[PDB]
Amino acid sequence: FMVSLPRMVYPQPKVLTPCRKDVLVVTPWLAPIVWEGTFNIDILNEQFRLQNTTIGLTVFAIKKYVAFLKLFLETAEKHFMVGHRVHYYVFTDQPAAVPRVTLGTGRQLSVLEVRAYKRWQDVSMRRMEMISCERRFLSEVDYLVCVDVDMEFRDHVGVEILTPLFGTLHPGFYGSSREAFTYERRPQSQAYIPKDEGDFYYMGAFFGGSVQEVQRLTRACHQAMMVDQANGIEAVWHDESHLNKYLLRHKPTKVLSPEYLWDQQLLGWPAVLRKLRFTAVPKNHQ
Ligand SMILES: O=c1ccn([C@@H]2O[C@H](COP(=O)(O)OP(=O)(O)O)[C@@H](O)[C@H]2O)c(=O)[nH]1
Ligand SMILES: OC[C@H]1O[C@@H](O)[C@H](O)[C@@H](O)[C@H]1O
Ligand SMILES: [Mn+2]
């Protein structure tokens, strides 16, 4: 049950004036595409605080990537769901290497030890299995957000992203035609998408939704990756190829713009991005 919003004073939306004329702000299945200037964060904050919303954030920091946790977490504290209840879940093979970061009130961090895999690809790929922790998340949070660690928050990332299921536009492909997307193109893979299908190319580094929908998504991608393994095939972009196949067949209820996943070193700061909110930290491949 949702109680009434209080009286609020804010600018009137006018239907004969668009917030943004330069970009697509709604998908053809009527999911908002979240750009700056499309949302009044004061109204959204009210709606979500009146539900005492709790957001979980998953992050894997395996092997060398524990080095990225300090900046990731400290900048999350400045910009990620400030004012709301947050539970970080840090999955790592080195619990002792997790930095001691000071958290704002209403925020908590759990360290979950997991195995390390040798291959970069398996570390990245086995996140879906590890995420799909099912019973704990259902008891502890309302939404789950699943991100890469080799990142920093530079600006607001808040409850405008929350919805039953979201993906984020990959910053290399938002202006591309579908045939240029790097979907898995071999029909022998479960992640296969033909050249005439596809709405968007979503990046594997930022997706989320309600616990139920995120558990559906990660269970389906883990099952599909097991089928591929049994068939001796590995999708071209690993878990990201399977996330794309899932989101083509189960449309997300919001899509985040590339404000939410950017690389300023490789792509600069185009005018179409009013804010750069969550960005890659430089790293050697290797
Ligand atoms: O040795 C590794 C390799 C990958 N990852 C995790 O897998 C994610 C995706 O890998 P990566 O960031 O290397 O992929 P990229 O963004 O460079 O394509 C990383 O952010 C980490 O969360 C990790 O923890 N240790
Ligand atoms: O083509 C898709 C690829 O694009 C790269 O820019 C990115 O580093 C990879 O992780 C993958 O998303
Ligand atoms: Mn990454």
Curated annotation (Swiss-Prot):
Q: Which organism is it from?
A: Homo sapiens (Human)
Q: Where does Mn(2+) bind?
A: D148, D150
Task: Tell me the impact of changing K283M.
Answer: In allele Bw08
Any GO BP: lipid glycosylation
Key word Secreted present: yes
Q: Pathway listed for it?
A: Protein modification; protein glycosylation
The residues annotated as the active site are: E240
Domain of life, per lineage: Eukaryota
> Domain comment, in the record's words?
The conserved DXD motif is involved in cofactor binding. The manganese ion interacts with the beta-phosphate group of UDP and may also have a role in catalysis.
Name of the protein described by the UniProt record: Histo-blood group ABO system transferase
Portion of the full-length sequence here: 64 to 349 of 354
Q: Which gene encodes it?
A: ABO
Co-factor note (free text): Binds 1 Mn(2+) ion per subunit.
Q: How is it modified after translation?
A: The soluble form derives from the membrane form by proteolytic processing.
Q: Which residues lie on this side of the membrane: Lumenal?
A: 3-286
Q: Where does UDP-N-acetyl-alpha-D-galactosamine bind?
A: F60, A61, I62, Y65, D148, V149, D150
